[PDB]
Structures are given as structure tokens and as C-alpha cells.
Amino acid sequence: SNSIQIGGLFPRGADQEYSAFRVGMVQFSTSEFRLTPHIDNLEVANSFAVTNAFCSQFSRGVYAIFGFYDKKSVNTITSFCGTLHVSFITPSFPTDGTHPFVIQMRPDLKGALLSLIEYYQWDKFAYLYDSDRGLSTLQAVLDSAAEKKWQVTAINVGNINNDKKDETYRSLFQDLELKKERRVILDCERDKVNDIVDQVITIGKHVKGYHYIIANLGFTDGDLLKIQFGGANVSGFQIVDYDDSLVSKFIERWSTLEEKEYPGAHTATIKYTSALTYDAVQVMTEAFRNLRKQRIEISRRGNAGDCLANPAVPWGQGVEIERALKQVQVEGLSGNIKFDQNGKRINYTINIMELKTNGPRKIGYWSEVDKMVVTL
Amino acid sequence: SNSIQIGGLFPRGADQEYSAFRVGMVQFSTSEFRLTPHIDNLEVANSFAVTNAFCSQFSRGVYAIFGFYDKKSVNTITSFCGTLHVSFITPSFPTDGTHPFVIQMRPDLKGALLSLIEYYQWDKFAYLYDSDRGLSTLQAVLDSAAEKKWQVTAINVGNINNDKKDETYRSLFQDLELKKERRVILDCERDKVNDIVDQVITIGKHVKGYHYIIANLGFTDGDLLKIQFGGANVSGFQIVDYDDSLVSKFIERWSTLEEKEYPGAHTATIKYTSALTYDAVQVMTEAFRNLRKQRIEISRRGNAGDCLANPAVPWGQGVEIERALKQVQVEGLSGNIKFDQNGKRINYTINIMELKTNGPRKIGYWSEVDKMVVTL
Numbered sequence: 001s002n003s004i005q006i007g008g009l010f011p012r013g014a015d016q017e018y019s020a021f022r023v024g025m026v027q028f029s030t031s032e033f034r035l036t037p038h039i040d041n042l043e044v045a046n047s048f049a050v051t052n053a054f055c056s057q058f059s060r061g062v063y064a065i066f067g068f069y070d071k072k073s074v075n076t077i078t079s080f081c082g083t084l085h086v087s088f089i090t091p092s093f094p095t096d097g098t099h100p101f102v103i104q105m106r107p108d109l110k111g112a113l114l115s116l117i118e119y120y121q122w123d124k125f126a127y128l129y130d131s132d133r134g135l136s137t138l139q140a141v142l143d144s145a146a147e148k149k150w151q152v153t154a155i156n157v158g159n160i161n162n163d164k165k166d167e168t169y170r171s172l173f174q175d176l177e178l179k180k181e182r183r184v185i186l187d188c189e190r191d192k193v194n195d196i197v198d199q200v201i202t203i204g205k206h207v208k209g210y211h212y213i214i215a216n217l218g219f220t221d222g223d224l225l226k227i228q229f230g231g232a233n234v235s236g237f238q239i240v241d242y243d244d245s246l247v248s249k250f251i252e253r254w255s256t257l258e259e260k261e262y263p264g265a266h267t268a269t270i271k272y273t274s275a276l277t278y279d280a281v282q283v284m285t286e287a288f289r290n291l292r293k294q295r296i297e298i299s300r301r302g303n304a305g306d307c308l309a310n311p312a313v314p315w316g317q318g319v320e321i322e323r324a325l326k327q328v329q330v331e332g333l334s335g336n337i338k339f340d341q342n343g344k345r346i347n348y349t350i351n352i353m354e355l356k357t358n359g360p361r362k363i364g365y366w367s368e369v370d371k372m373v374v375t376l
Numbered sequence: 377s378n379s380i381q382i383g384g385l386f387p388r389g390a391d392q393e394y395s396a397f398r399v400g401m402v403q404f405s406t407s408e409f410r411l412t413p414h415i416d417n418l419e420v421a422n423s424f425a426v427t428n429a430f431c432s433q434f435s436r437g438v439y440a441i442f443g444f445y446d447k448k449s450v451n452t453i454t455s456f457c458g459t460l461h462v463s464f465i466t467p468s469f470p471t472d473g474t475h476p477f478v479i480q481m482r483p484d485l486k487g488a489l490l491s492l493i494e495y496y497q498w499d500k501f502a503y504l505y506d507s508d509r510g511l512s513t514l515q516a517v518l519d520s521a522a523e524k525k526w527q528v529t530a531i532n533v534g535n536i537n538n539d540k541k542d543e544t545y546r547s548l549f550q551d552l553e554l555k556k557e558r559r560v561i562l563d564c565e566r567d568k569v570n571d572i573v574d575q576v577i578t579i580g581k582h583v584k585g586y587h588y589i590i591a592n593l594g595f596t597d598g599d600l601l602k603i604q605f606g607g608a609n610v611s612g613f614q615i616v617d618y619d620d621s622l623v624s625k626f627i628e629r630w631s632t633l634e635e636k637e638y639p640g641a642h643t644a645t646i647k648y649t650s651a652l653t654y655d656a657v658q659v660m661t662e663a664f665r666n667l668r669k670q671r672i673e674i675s676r677r678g679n680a681g682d683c684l685a686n687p688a689v690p691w692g693q694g695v696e697i698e699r700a701l702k703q704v705q706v707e708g709l710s711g712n713i714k715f716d717q718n719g720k721r722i723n724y725t726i727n728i729m730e731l732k733t734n735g736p737r738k739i740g741y742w743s744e745v746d747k748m749v750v751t752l
């Protein structure tokens with residue numbers, strides 16, 4: 001048997017991620033033990049919902065929770081996890097701090113972004129953002145601006161009501177035009193980028209003389225073809241490397257999976273959040289394997305009880321499970337996976353990309369310790 | 377014997393605010409009914425703690441909750457209140473959105489601040505912000521910077537370990553001794569403002585040629601006397617007008633209370649947060665009084681239950697309570713109190729202040745519809 005109960009907290013509509021999760025469950029299945037996921041699908045921005053689901057898993061008796069949060073709900077997660085010693089493994093944006101009991105699959109992007117800016121020798125640009133992943137990056141660029149004498153125009157595009165969102169664009173570009181802004185960073189939710197890209201194309205700002213940096217880890221995850229021929233420079237970041245044999249092999253299978261059975265999966269690419277979901281199954285699997293290999297018993301003796309029991313007394317095995325997960329080092333879709341004591345990715349690589357007439361191309365990479373290295 | 381129960385969620389050090397709350401309960405109590413508060417003292421930044429306390433008050437069957445939140449716990453409050461139709465009345469920062477079931481006693485400060493900056497005809501300035509407290513008003517000035525043609529140098533003053541503090545704050549100003557920054561916006565809690573004022577004085581930057589804008593609603597809550605004679609301009613905002621008889625008559629009383637019975641309350645001034653709290657007791661009282669004047673029965677028949685009951689079916693009378701709360705229009709320590717449909721203060725007034733050798737003086741006022749008006 002060896003059935004190991006875990007929770008799965010999935011946003012509604014995260015079909016590809018859940019398909020990647022199930023493929024991960026197949027890939028990393030083993031006779032040693034079985035991960036036994038209990039799945040909740042919910043509105044990840046709704047803290048009540050996230051608390052209900054967390055507590056429901058907790059009372060069932062899970063040994064770890066894999067899932068997602070939003071900026072509206074990250075504090076529910078870090079606070080419940082930290083209080084009860086339950087480990088959360090997530091592909092979402094890294095928490096802004098050193099919160100314990102959170103294993104963060106997603107590498108920090110800020111460093112690479114700052115180096116890229118320096119690399120193109122920008123000292124004046126617009127930073128167009130929303131806040132769904134917090135404001136860490138905004139702070140990082142403001143700090144750099146002050147320190148390197150950059151003139152940054154930083155504008156929150158997150159709050160343009162899509163119910164009348166067009167006069168709002170003209171006024172945005174009017175503001176940008178005041179200083180003839182031509183270098184632009186887009187750090188937004190993926191549909192937000194696409195909205196902004198259409199908006200740019202429409203007013204002819206996708207021509208030569210413009211240069212956009214897409215500040216996310218999935219440059220090729222969405223539709224680049226529409227700005228591929230206008231003449232503007234377009235650059236970005238990619239944590240999933242389709243030239244890795246490991247990734248290449250996975251895509252051979254992924255690309256042929258039955259779409260009815262694996263929604264989101266009959267394609268040549270996989271979104272980085274889905275790749276990280278797949279990699280998370282490997283990490284959890286290795287953690288429980290390592291514990292068993294170390295002869296560390298983590299089996300629950302009694303019921304977890306109510307997540308709101310007062311006083312909140314953390315189970316003693318919590319720390320053990322946190323440590324096992326943080327000590328995992330493996331190779332996955334997102335390259336070398338290793339964590340520091342705070343569950344943040346270290347020793348990872350981010351590929352730096354440029355859009356060219358013949359498609360997106362790697363021009364080099366950013367190293368978690370060597371910064372930006374061009375490929376010759 | 378008409379006991380309407382309510383909750384009070386008080387941050388673990390909010391002594392003066394609790395004193396203010398207890399005073400308002402006396403001032404506004406009546407033979408009609410007695411608000412019967414149940415009080416929790418808690419780590420307001422701890423979302424788990426906040427959920428526990430909310431759920432504990434929900435189970436008791438309170439008819440509303442007066443309380444405080446933090447930027448880390450605000451989502452817990454809005455989600456739980458919005459889901460369960462439990463009204464939260466608070467002097468905390470207004471929410472970033474139109475969340476329902478939240479009565480925000482504190483007026484928005486962004487308009488007045490943006491207006492004041494324009495008034496002084498600033499184009500280049502430093503903005504000291506406190507990440508602990510939030511970035512919301514910084515963002516508003518960053519959004520506006522293009523259209524209003526400003527060059528903003530934003531510095532985070534928010535992760536200072538009190539160990540150093542002195543050294544950090546001096547390093548900060550001896551760094552603004554680079555771009556020749558002399559116009560500085562504060563945007564901090566009154567304590568952090570005091571700390572900074574203390575260091576500006578020690579560094580000798582409170583002289584003529586520097587100008588500080590304190591971006592909180594309590595210009596005279598702190599000690600201005602010490603920076604009054606240096607020669608620097610110092611401007612701020614004030615919502616509690618001590619020239620009003622209502623306020624003067626209140627302070628007559630407040631200055632008299634025994635400090636042992638009412639911590640924080642043997643003084644001439646009163647923090648705008650405590651004033652908003654006193655005001656909150658009037659609003660809650662009027663709302664529930666008005667529900668009776670309209671023979672809207674709101675008495676719960678059966679137990680409220682568990683905040684984690686599933687499915688979540690909100691009680692029928694929540695919406696009536698919310699509406700009654702939002703329909704209240706009274707005059708209080710913070711001036712005319714009125715709310716829109718999203719529980720935000722409307723038709724309120726913010727006084728504009730400058731520090732003079734003879735003390736703080738009102739120089740004008742800011743209105744929702746008139747914007748900035750020089751007084752004469």
C-alpha cells in the first residue's frame with residue numbers, strides 16, 4: 001500500500017496544469033509508495049475559499065499540499081502553513097519574504113530582469129505592470145532606478161476596466177508619448193500582455209524603434225507571431241528549454257496525448273506553470289522517498305482535527321516534511337531544481353530570448369550566480 | 377435589555393483606540409438598545425489569527441464587527457465578510473477595490489495628496505514609502521507622474537530593523553545628498569514619521585530649503601514642535617478639526633478621563649485612528665437605531681453556526697444591516713460622515729496644514745468635488 005495523502009488546490013480553468021499534474025503522477029509513480037491526491041478546484045483569489053479548502057485537506061489528514069495562490073490569497077496560505085507546519089508546494093509567484101513551509105517551484109525573475117535591462121543599456125523606459133504577483137518587482141526596479149539614475153515611468157495597468165477599456169489605452173499612450181517612450185517592460189498577467197500587445201499593434205507602436213521586454217518566465221507560452229513582423233524588438237525569458245533532451249522527450253509524449261483526456265495537452269509547448277506543476281510531483285515524490293530512505297516515520301497517529309483548534313499545536317512531523325522537500329535536488333522540465341532554507345529556487349538558469357522574423361531565439365542565459373551570459 | 381451584540385477586533389497595542397471605543401459606547405448608548413461588544417485582542421497581521429477571531433465572533437452571533445486589518449490580513453476580512461454578509465466597520469486603510477460588507481471610516485488620502493503636490497508646483501521630489509504599511513498611494517503618484525510631469529525618487533523606508541535605524545535613516549538622507557533632493561514626501565505611520573523627523577533634525581535637514589509633506593491624516597497627532605523652528609516647510613493633512621465645537625466639547629471630556637481607566641486618553645489631541653473609532657460607534661448605533669425606526673427585524677433566530685460550514689449560505693438580514701450602515705449620515709470627530717454604496721467616505725473634508733513658528737495652521741481644505749481650496 002504505502003498510500004501518502006496529499007492535497008491539490010487548483011484554480012478553476014487551470015486545465016493544462018492539472019493535466020501536467022496527472023502526467024506527473026503517472027511518470028513518477030513507483031511501487032515504493034503512492035501519492036494519493038485529494039483535489040479541490042476553486043477560485044484562488046477568494047481567501048474564504050482557499051481557507052475552506054486548506055482546512056478541509058488539513059482535517060482529512062494530508063501530508064503536504066500542492067497548489068496555487070494569488071496576491072489576494074498568499075497570506076492565507078503562508079499564515080495557515082506556517083502556523084500548522086503544513087508544507088505548501090506551489091508554482092505561483094515566490095512569496096515576498098522567508099515564510100517557512102512554502103516550497104516555491106517558480107524561480108525569482110527580478111535579477112534576470114534587472115540584468116537584461118542593463119544588458120540593453122536602458123536608462124529610461126516604461127514599466128507597465130499589474131499586481132497579481134505582488135509588487136516586489138516594482139520595488140526592485142524603483143530601487144535600481146534611484147541607484148543607477150534611470151528615468152522609469154511606472155504605471156499600474158491592472159485596473160483598466162475591460163468594460164470600457166479603450167479610452168483608457170489612448171490616455172495611457174498619451175502619457176507615454178509625453179516623453180516619447182519607446183522602451184517598454186510588460187510585467188502583467190498573461191491575458192493582460194496580450195491585450196496590451198493588440199493595443200500596441202493597433203496604434204502602430206509595434207514597428208522599428210520600439211522595444212518590449214515581456215517580464216515573465218514563458219516568452220513562447222503565448223502568441224508572438226502577431227508582433228513578429230512589425231519591426232519592434234521583443235525580448236523575454238524562458239525557464240523551459242525545448243532543446244534539453246529531457247524536455248524534448250516529454251514534449252514528444254505531451255504533444256500526442258489525447259486532448260479530451262488531457263485538456264491543454266496536445267501541443268508543442270507547455271506553459272511554464274504547467275511544467276512547474278509536473279516538476280512539483282517529482283519533488284514531492286523525492287521528498288517522501290528520502291524520508292523513507294532515512295527511516296523517518298511521519299505517519300499520523302491521530303486525526304489532524306480542526307484547522308481552527310485553539311491552541312494551534314503543530315504536528316511534530318511537520319518540520320521533518322518541510323526539510324525533506326527543501327533538500328530535494330533533481331532535474332526537471334524547468335532545469336536544475338534546488339532550494340534554499342526558505343524554499344526558494346537556487347542554482348537555476350533562465351534563458352534570455354529575442355523575437356526574430358524566423359521565430360523566438362535564445363541569445364543567452366541568466367545564471368542564479370553568474371548573471372547574464374551571451375551565447376556565441 | 378435590548379442587547380445587540382457586536383464584535384471588536386483590536387490590534388494588540390491599540391490602547392487609545394480601545395479607550396476611544398469605550399468612550400463612544402458611553403456617549404451614544406441609549407434606552408432603546410445597548411451595543412454589547414465582544415472584544416478580541418490579536419496579532420492583526422496574522423491571517424490565521426484574524427480568521428480565528430472572525431470565526432469566533434461569527435459563531436457567537438454578532439450582528440456586525442468593528443475592527444482593524446493589516447495589508448496582510450485585509451483579504452481575509454473582505455473575503456469572509458463578503459461571503460457571509462457580515463459587516464465589518466473599520467478605521468483602517470480603505471480597501472483597494474469595491475469590496476462589499478466593509479464600512480470604511482477612513483477617507484481616501486490620495487486625491488488631497490496629489491492635489492497638494494500640484495499646489496506647491498513640485499516637479500521633482502523624493503517619496504519615502506513604508507512597504508510594511510502599503511504601496512497604494514505611492515502607486516497613485518507613480519501613475520500620475522507622467523501626466524503631471526513629475527520626477528519621483530521612491531525610497532522604501534519599510535524594512536528597517538530597529539537595531540540600526542539611526543544609521544539607516546542617516547544613510548538614506550546622506551544619499552539623497554546626491555541628486556540634491558530637498559522636497560520629500562513621508563507617507564508613514566505617525567511613529568515612523570517621528571523617527572524620521574528625529575533623524576532629519578539630527579542631520580540638520582530641517583532647515584530652510586527643505587520641504588516635507590507628511591502623507592497621513594493626522595498632521596498634529598505627533599510632535600511637530602521639535603521641527604518647528606528649523607526653517608523647513610512641513611505640510612500635512614488633518615481630518616479631526618479641533619476648532620469644531622463637537623470636537624472641542626469631546627476633548628474637554630477626553631482630557632479629563634483618568635489615564636488608568638482610559639489608556640491614551642488624558643491628552644489634548646487624539647490620533648485620527650481613535651477619532652474614527654469613536655465615530656464608528658456612532659455609525660453603528662445610528663444604523664441599528666434606523667433599522668428599528670423602519671421595523672426591519674434583524675434578530676437572528678438560529679445560531680450563526682461555523683464560519684466553515686459548507687455550503688456557505690449567508691443570512692438573509694446581512695444585506696439590510698449593510699445597507700443601514702451605509703445609509704447613516706452623521707457629523708462626528710472626523711467631520712461629516714457619509715458613505716457610498718461601497719462603504720467609502722463621501723462628501724468628507726481634509727484640512728491642509730503647514731507648520732509655522734506659532735504652530736500648525738490650517739491653510740485650506742480638500743473636498744471630493746472642489747479639490748484643493750486655499751483658506752481666507
Ligand SMILES: *[C@@H]1O[C@H](CO)[C@@H](O[C@@H]2O[C@H](CO)[C@@H](O)[C@H](O)[C@H]2NC(C)=O)[C@H](O)[C@H]1NC(C)=O
Pocket residue numbers: 182183209210211233
Ligand atoms: C532594437 O535593437 C536594436 C539592435 O540592437 C537596437 O539598435 C542598436 O542599439 C544602439 C543604440 O541605439 C545603436 O547605436 C546600434 O547601432 C544598434 N545596432 C544595430 C546594428 O542596429 C535598438 O536600440 C533597439 N530598439 C530600441 C528602441 O531600443
Ligand SMILES: *[C@@H]1O[C@H](CO)[C@@H](O[C@@H]2O[C@H](CO)[C@@H](O)[C@H](O)[C@H]2NC(C)=O)[C@H](O)[C@H]1NC(C)=O
Pocket residue numbers: 558559584585586587609
Ligand atoms: C517653502 O515654501 C515657500 C512658499 O510656498 C516656497 O516658495 C517661496 O515662495 C515663492 C513662491 O515660489 C518663491 O519665489 C520663494 O523663493 C520661496 N521662498 C523662499 C525664501 O524660498 C519655497 O520654495 C519652499 N521651500 C521648498 C524647498 O520647497
